[PDB]
Amino acid sequence: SALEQFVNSVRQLSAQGQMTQLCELINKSGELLAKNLSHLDTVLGALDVQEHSLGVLAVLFVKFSMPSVPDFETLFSQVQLFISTCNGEHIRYATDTFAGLCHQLTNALVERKQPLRGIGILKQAIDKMQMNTNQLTSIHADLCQLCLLAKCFKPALPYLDVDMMDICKENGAYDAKHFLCYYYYGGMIYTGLKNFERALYFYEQAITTPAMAVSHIMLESYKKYILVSLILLGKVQQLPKYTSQIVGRFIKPLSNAYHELAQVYSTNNPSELRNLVNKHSETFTRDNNMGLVKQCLSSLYKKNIQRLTKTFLTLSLQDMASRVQLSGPQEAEKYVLHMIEDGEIFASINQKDGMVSFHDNPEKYNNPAMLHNIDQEMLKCIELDERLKAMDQEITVNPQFVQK
Amino acid sequence: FSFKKLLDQCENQELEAPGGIATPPVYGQLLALYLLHNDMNNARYLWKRIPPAIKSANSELGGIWSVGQRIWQRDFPGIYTTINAHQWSETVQPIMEALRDATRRRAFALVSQAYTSIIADDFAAFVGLPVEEAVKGILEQGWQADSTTRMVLPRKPEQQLARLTDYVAFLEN
């Protein structure tokens, strides 16, 4: 009855402008909107669907119960079709219910334990809600969790290799939880694929978030930051100067096992490290990062062997497997061979004499291919400077930056 | 070549084609094709996300994650032994016909700069050939063996002017 006036209004208000009042009347709710609207959804979608479908589906999905009851397959199909072919720039006028719909879908999928169907849905929603590809949206924190609870790390790689330079305001909302979760789950994904250089960066961008209270998403971004820094480098990297003081007041004392682990991973001695992993085995397995700690123990040997290259020019395998405590020339042979195969060391084995000869002569910079490296590194800085100038001229002409 | 296209095809048919779980054919094809490209990090998660129903019904997949561990804990004789253990339909036969060549080339490239003198017996296990057949075929490449002791010695085998102008135009603005 009354809905017929509401449905027709969106039909006539749209396709002729008046987009400001459209979002106003959508925000007028409708008091459960007579939830049986499943029939009118298809007809209302004149041309490339419409915008009122988002308003209907947002109310439908969060009835805080029985999503839409067992209409799930139909509800999921409607959501998938809408997101695939919503089209239009109009979907950017209301980036407050779109993100809410995607978040509700993510929560329902996580609860129902099928976080693989939604990886394909939150790939067009991200693509069709951000201005450019360098803008962080609140949906980026949903895909990075859907593809993490359902081990499928590669779909998220295109959305983690972009250096974000803008954050969507989403017309309200966008609490710091989304920003912290994106830069924590991205770090976890990169750690899972053994890309530690960027996992460390992603964790660091979550620790240094401005804060005044302790959140249990920044604790398990310092605990893992320590381990990833100890694996990638030989020591815990220094956090940036602008780090919030809350990390250095409550976060640090709460993580005392990991600082002790770094202390032991400061004097090169695997005997104490192996004992410390077992003594604190409750903490390291309660935080779920047990397995990222054994990587530190395995990396201590690989660090010691590399430290042998700074003093020796030819070592005996039996003699080598007595300073790094490998207990056997046969195992030291494979330990060196694995490191040679991975490009971590420059050495050669001699099974006749049984001796490892360290070369320590990778490259002389007279290669026409190194010129390509310098050219690429120069082009990246050129693009970076162009970006800085571009988002500096936008401040130079700001009417607020003429009065001060 | 052609295997990368197959890989991305199975990736797409895993993501968007099914209702959460794909067919055992494409599942096993992707699992075996990840090993060919040496992507063990992705293969471990592919095996970890497989539902515990295809595993207990299509047991052949459990065979494929019997080669993988051999690549995981690097063991060339284990790889060669395990490859020649099981068999499936015409979906992994050309997969484990290029995997053999890839592994045998990886072994040759491994013992070409890591070792400067290696026993022939160990080299045979590395490459995956009988010792007598391995030594005779070595000599063609130029690697000098040494008989009566079996110690094979492996032997090692357009717009610049525009770019410079672009750099100058940038520095001087």
Binding site: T396, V397, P399, V402 | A169, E172, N173
Partner: peptide, 24 residues
């Protein structure tokens, strides 16, 4: 070079216009 100085002069002209209209 010509494009860069045209852009710089246009930004300066915009800033000057903003300064002028700000006197209201």
């Amino acid at each position: 070079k010509e494009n860069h100085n045209r852009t710089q002069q246009q930004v300066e002209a915009e800033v000057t216009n903003i300064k002028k209209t700000l006197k209201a």
